[PDB]
Amino acid sequence: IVGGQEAPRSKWPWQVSLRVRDRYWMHFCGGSLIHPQWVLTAAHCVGPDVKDLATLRVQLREQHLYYQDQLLPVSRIIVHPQFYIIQTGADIALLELEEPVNISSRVHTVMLPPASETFPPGMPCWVTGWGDVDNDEPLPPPFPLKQVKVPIMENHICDAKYHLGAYTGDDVRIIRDDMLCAGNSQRDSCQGDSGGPLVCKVNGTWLQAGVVSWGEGCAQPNRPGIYTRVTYYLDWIHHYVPK
Amino acid sequence: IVGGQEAPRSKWPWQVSLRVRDRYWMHFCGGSLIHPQWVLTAAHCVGPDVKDLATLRVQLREQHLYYQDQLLPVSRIIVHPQFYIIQTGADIALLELEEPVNISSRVHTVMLPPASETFPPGMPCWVTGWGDVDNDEPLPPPFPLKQVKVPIMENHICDAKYHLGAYTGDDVRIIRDDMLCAGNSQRDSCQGDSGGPLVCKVNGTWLQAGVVSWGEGCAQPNRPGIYTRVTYYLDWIHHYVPK
Amino acid sequence: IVGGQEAPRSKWPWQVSLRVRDRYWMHFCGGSLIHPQWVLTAAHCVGPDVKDLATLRVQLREQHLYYQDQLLPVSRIIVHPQFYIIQTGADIALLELEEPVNISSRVHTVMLPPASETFPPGMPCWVTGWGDVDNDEPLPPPFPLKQVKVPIMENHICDAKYHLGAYTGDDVRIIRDDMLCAGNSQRDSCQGDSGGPLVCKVNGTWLQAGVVSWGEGCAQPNRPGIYTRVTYYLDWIHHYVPK
Amino acid sequence: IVGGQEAPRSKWPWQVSLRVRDRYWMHFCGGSLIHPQWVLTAAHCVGPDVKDLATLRVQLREQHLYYQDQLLPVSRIIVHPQFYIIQTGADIALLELEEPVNISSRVHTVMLPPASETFPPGMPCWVTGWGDVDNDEPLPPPFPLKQVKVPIMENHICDAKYHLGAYTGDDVRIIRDDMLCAGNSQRDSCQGDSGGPLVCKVNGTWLQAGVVSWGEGCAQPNRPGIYTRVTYYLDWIHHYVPK
Ligand SMILES: *[C@@H]1O[C@H](CO[C@@H]2O[C@@H](C)[C@@H](O)[C@@H](O)[C@@H]2O)[C@@H](O[C@@H]2O[C@H](CO)[C@@H](O)[C@H](O)[C@H]2NC(C)=O)[C@H](O[C@@H]2O[C@@H](C)[C@@H](O)[C@@H](O)[C@@H]2O)[C@H]1NC(C)=O
Ligand SMILES: *[C@@H]1O[C@H](CO[C@@H]2O[C@@H](C)[C@@H](O)[C@@H](O)[C@@H]2O)[C@@H](O[C@@H]2O[C@H](CO)[C@@H](O)[C@H](O)[C@H]2NC(C)=O)[C@H](O[C@@H]2O[C@@H](C)[C@@H](O)[C@@H](O)[C@@H]2O)[C@H]1NC(C)=O
Numbered sequence: 001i002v003g004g005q006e007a008p009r010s011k012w013p014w015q016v017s018l019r020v021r022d023r024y025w026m027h028f029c030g031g032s033l034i035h036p037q038w039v040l041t042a043a044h045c046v047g048p049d050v051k052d053l054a055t056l057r058v059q060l061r062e063q064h065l066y067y068q069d070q071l072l073p074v075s076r077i078i079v080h081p082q083f084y085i086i087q088t089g090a091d092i093a094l095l096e097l098e099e100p101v102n103i104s105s106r107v108h109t110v111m112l113p114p115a116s117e118t119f120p121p122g123m124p125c126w127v128t129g130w131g132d133v134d135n136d137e138p139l140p141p142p143f144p145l146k147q148v149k150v151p152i153m154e155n156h157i158c159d160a161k162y163h164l165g166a167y168t169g170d171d172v173r174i175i176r177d178d179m180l181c182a183g184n185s186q187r188d189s190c191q192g193d194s195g196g197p198l199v200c201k202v203n204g205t206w207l208q209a210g211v212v213s214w215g216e217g218c219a220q221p222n223r224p225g226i227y228t229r230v231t232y233y234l235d236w237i238h239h240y241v242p243k
Numbered sequence: 244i245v246g247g248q249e250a251p252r253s254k255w256p257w258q259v260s261l262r263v264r265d266r267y268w269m270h271f272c273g274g275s276l277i278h279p280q281w282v283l284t285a286a287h288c289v290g291p292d293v294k295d296l297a298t299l300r301v302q303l304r305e306q307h308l309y310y311q312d313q314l315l316p317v318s319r320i321i322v323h324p325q326f327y328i329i330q331t332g333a334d335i336a337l338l339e340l341e342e343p344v345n346i347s348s349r350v351h352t353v354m355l356p357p358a359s360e361t362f363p364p365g366m367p368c369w370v371t372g373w374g375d376v377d378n379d380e381p382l383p384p385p386f387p388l389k390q391v392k393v394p395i396m397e398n399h400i401c402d403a404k405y406h407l408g409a410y411t412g413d414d415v416r417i418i419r420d421d422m423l424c425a426g427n428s429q430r431d432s433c434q435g436d437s438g439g440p441l442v443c444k445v446n447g448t449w450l451q452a453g454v455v456s457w458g459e460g461c462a463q464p465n466r467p468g469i470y471t472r473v474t475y476y477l478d479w480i481h482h483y484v485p486k
Numbered sequence: 487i488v489g490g491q492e493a494p495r496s497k498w499p500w501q502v503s504l505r506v507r508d509r510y511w512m513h514f515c516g517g518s519l520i521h522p523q524w525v526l527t528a529a530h531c532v533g534p535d536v537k538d539l540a541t542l543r544v545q546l547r548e549q550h551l552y553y554q555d556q557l558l559p560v561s562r563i564i565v566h567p568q569f570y571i572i573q574t575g576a577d578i579a580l581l582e583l584e585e586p587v588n589i590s591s592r593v594h595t596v597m598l599p600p601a602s603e604t605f606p607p608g609m610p611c612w613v614t615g616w617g618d619v620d621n622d623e624p625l626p627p628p629f630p631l632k633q634v635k636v637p638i639m640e641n642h643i644c645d646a647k648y649h650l651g652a653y654t655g656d657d658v659r660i661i662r663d664d665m666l667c668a669g670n671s672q673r674d675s676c677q678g679d680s681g682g683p684l685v686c687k688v689n690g691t692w693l694q695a696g697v698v699s700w701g702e703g704c705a706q707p708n709r710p711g712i713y714t715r716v717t718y719y720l721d722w723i724h725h726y727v728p729k
Numbered sequence: 730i731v732g733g734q735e736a737p738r739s740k741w742p743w744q745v746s747l748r749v750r751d752r753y754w755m756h757f758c759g760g761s762l763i764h765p766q767w768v769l770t771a772a773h774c775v776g777p778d779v780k781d782l783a784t785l786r787v788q789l790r791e792q793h794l795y796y797q798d799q800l801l802p803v804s805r806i807i808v809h810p811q812f813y814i815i816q817t818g819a820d821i822a823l824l825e826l827e828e829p830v831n832i833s834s835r836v837h838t839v840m841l842p843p844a845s846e847t848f849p850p851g852m853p854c855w856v857t858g859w860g861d862v863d864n865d866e867p868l869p870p871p872f873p874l875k876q877v878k879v880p881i882m883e884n885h886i887c888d889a890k891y892h893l894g895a896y897t898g899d900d901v902r903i904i905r906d907d908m909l910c911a912g913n914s915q916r917d918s919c920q921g922d923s924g925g926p927l928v929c930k931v932n933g934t935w936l937q938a939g940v941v942s943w944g945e946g947c948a949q950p951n952r953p954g955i956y957t958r959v960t961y962y963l964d965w966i967h968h969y970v971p972k
């Protein structure tokens with residue numbers, strides 16, 4: 001997370017950390033609890049190949065990464081079938097936990113947006129995670145969970161921005177409809193934040209607008225952060241996660 | 244180049260090295276001389292942003308990188324307009340040299356294939372470059388140009404290979420018509436070889452079949468190297484490069 | 487610490503961590519509380535030059551590095567005058583704290599040995615720290631304080647071991663009287679442990695026998711860990727630290 | 730080499746490069762040809778343990794490292810017996826080649842100094858090598874042999890300099906009689922230059938005064954480069970190398 005501050009302990013009860021077995025259970029991506037037994041994340045977090053499930057764990061909300069771990073094994077990994085190597089469309093996946101977690105004030109699910117919510121410019125949104133605090137600048141120990149308020153940029157304007165200083169034809173769409181843009185050159189998500197949540201407060205309720213996916217650099221001029229647009233994948237999510 | 248040998252001085256007179264101004268004019272990609280004044284390379288080599296031409300130079304055929312350099316300036320870069328960030332299609336670009344090179348037996352152009360050549364399995368083809376000799380293993384000093392014979396894999400067979408061990412739907416195409424596959428778990432191109440040529444000996448004549456583009460790993464089982472298919476872009480190339 | 491286990495919370499109340507101002511107060515050496523206002527460490531830890539004390543902090547016994555830090559500034563540093571660069575004798579120093587720490591069962595001083603104690607082979611001794619767990623292998627997050635029992639090796643036996651496979655003449659002493667040897671190819675201290683304590687249980691009382699100093703590799707065959715012998719410098723220590 | 734310039738091809742016909750087998754024959758230190766069959770270098774270059782000779786090679790003078798290598802195997806390694814791990818005295822070693830080398834104007838021996846030559850301040854001296862051009866800044870390809878003129882600092886003055894900003898007792902000698910000091914904050918040898926020659930022109934003749942050994946940093950204020958004083962070891966050298 002670039003340009004943000006440490007999250008208060010009572011915020012983002014749905015934030016999770018994905019861990020891979022490598023000398024220790026190392027964080028590699030974020031995710032969000034969307035049901036007592038399901039985690040939402042990015043397809044590229046669990047790629048490029050089908051993973052041996054024994055090598056992965058999920059950690060529910062922690063103010064400081066690694067310090068009070070209670071790691072949870074995963075029962076199944078479901079990656080959107082339209083997703084493939086070196087491309088950013090359909091960057092979404094689900095992790096079914098072996099067990100349903102206890103829901104509480106400190107740990108609980110985030111609501112998915114209704115299909116009609118477009119999350120227009122001006123909407124108040126925050127992206128959270130334990131990722132880099134700047135390009136190639138990792139979050140220092142004790143690894144506090146960070147948050148940053150990011151401005152939403154309308155898709156067409158965002159697509160135009162991505163064409164500035166690029167070789168791509170004006171009529172070639174970089175930012176697609178299953179994507180959402182947020183951030184500026186001072187506030188953004190970054191490497192290490194992938195798969196985590198972009199949430200917006202709509203009429204007093206927190207809704208998950210996006211999943212951290214990609215961007216050119218982090219907080220780079222004319223390059224807003226790109227998120228998988230959750231509303232676009234609600235039917236797919238609903239095939240697996242119960243109401 | 245993975246699994247090859249150092250190239251004889253008399254081979255591959257069209258091979259070029261692209262250089263970026265660092266603490267030295269460091270090699271970052273390959274290319275091929277297809278006209279006395281034009282170099283063919285990969286779009287991602289001169290990406291992601293429009294380049295300041297002052298930071299780039301071209302080095303024509305030399306046996307060892309950096310030793311007997313004679314760097315040439317670039318007057319123009321043309322990247323296929325369909326090309327954009329974090330996607331692999333249309334990975335092709337042209338570099339116009341400031342001056343046409345003096346053609347000799349040691350340095351000359353490579354012939355482009357006729358639109359009808361498909362380069363089917365069994366065709367003898369070589370890929371050349373100064374790239375990594377293994378995953379994360381750079382070419383050691385004195386940086387000899389290397390070559391390796393790589394087996395062609397038919398596109399659909401190759402597409403199926405890339406679905407092995409992947410979450411991608413069988414109906415979702417990974418390998419496209421503007422791509423060509425070559426290489427196996429013993430012989431392949433790698434990071435540092437991008438933009439360079441894959442040439443095949445077709446009934447007595449060398450024809451450039453592809454441009455090193457991407458792959459999962461280098462010489463990784465079931466993941467052949469992927470090249471931009473030259474015949475697919477002949478019309479685009481001929482729009483800029485004279486007869 | 488190579489070959490040990492995480493230490494119980496009730497153990498080693500005298501252990502301290504020395505911190506340097508980087509992007510965070512990063513751990514670089516260990517030390518021991520030998521008086522409520524004095525920390526004992528290795529001279530090379532506070533070298534090569536006279537330090538700007540604004541760049542250093544002391545952290546008393548904590549179970550995990552960086553988590554519940556309560557950093558203390560250093561009033562002054564006193565390095566043994568016989569110590570100099572690229573030489574390993576007289577590797578010992580004292581850090582005076584601004585004020586005395588509150589002594590409790592979880593944080594208290596370690597007893598220094600009486601001048602006559604030689605700590606011969608067979609003595610049960612432990613070395614503790616947050617250093618590397620193998621050669622070039624840092625302690626993984628959450629950075630638990632580790633401990634390992636290390637076997638003592640008599641000095642001359644140790645001196646002979648260091649001549650094995652070395653060009654040094656047999657009459658040239660490598661291990662000196664102000665040094666103590668401990669550890670084997672399974673258990674040892676390592677980089678990051680320097681300045682920390684080697685304590686032995688003597689007739690029911692823990693006494694600090696040495697200060698982690700140097701060695702060839704960590705847990706390397708025929709290369710036991712080398713420690714500054716505390717009894718050798720009691721007079722120098724008592725010149726600053728009250729009884 | 731810090732400061733200075735690339736050497737004319739006609740200078741330093743005695744410079745050699747020591748290579749270790751590591752993916753390629755990698756340069757790790759310099760040396761000097763002091764007899765058609767003997768190379769003089771630093772003991773620490775061939776430490777810390779007795780080396781398997783199959784892993785070492787010597788390369789005679791070449792303008793650019795790695796490019797026109799003609800590697801030579803070593804028959805014997807003789808390290809001064811007073812030298813030992815982590816200490817800087819007696820930093821001198823000899824390598825006997827399997828065969829005598831051909832002597833020419835471009836490749837020949839450097840003369841050793843008479844025992845009476847003290848190389849006092851004011852003497853014109855140059856240090857040469859392929860090492861770092863600044864702290865942690867390696868020589869870039871094509872790796873030209875570099876040279877720099879360095880001023881001699883009298884031993885006592887030098888010893889006093891090394892006490893400036895250090896904790897060492899004024900009466901504790903850092904710079905010893907078997908050492909020689911040369912260089913300043915603008916001109917110096919560095920990592921990668923060890924074992925190479927410091928030569929001074931005396932009454933029109935080049936004599937090897939020192940062997941690159943150590944220093945605090947490279948070209949660091951109040952820290953001249955420290956060399957093994959060749960005259961101090963003439964008897965030892967003469968026990969093995971024919972006059
Ligand atoms: C799920 O929550 C159960 C109930 O926890 C208690 O009530 C909650 C509302 C909350 O206030 C919590 O802090 C309370 O502890 C847990 O069971 C309880 O576990 C504690 C020990 O951690 C034990 O002292 C209680 O007797 C026990 N009560 C019950 C209803 O059994 C679950 O813990 C698991 O089940 C326990 C029986 C035990 O096997 C423990 O090791 C298990 O983790 C909570 N489950 C999880 C996944 O944490
Ligand atoms: C040692 O030098 C011999 C003579 O070198 C030649 O004369 C010099 C004055 C100079 O002009 C130099 O450039 C010349 O090459 C070498 O022998 C010569 O080697 C060359 C091939 O390298 C050959 O064509 C010559 O006929 C031959 N002449 C003689 C007098 O033998 C030595 O080379 C080695 O020995 C050779 C016989 C051959 O086996 C070659 O492969 C060897 O390298 C030089 N020795 C070394 C170790 O370099």
Ligand SMILES: *[C@@H]1O[C@H](CO)[C@@H](O)[C@H](O)[C@H]1NC(C)=O
Nearest residue numbers: 114116117118119202203204
């Ligand atoms: C928010 O609430 C107001 C008042 O109830 C309503 O008019 C508006 O449409 C609501 N917006 C959304 C996105 O539900």
Ligand SMILES: *[C@@H]1O[C@H](CO)[C@@H](O)[C@H](O)[C@H]1NC(C)=O
Nearest residue numbers: 843845846847930931932933
């Ligand atoms: C250099 O030459 C001069 C004049 O011949 C002589 O006096 C001086 O001592 C010589 N120095 C050496 C080292 O020979």
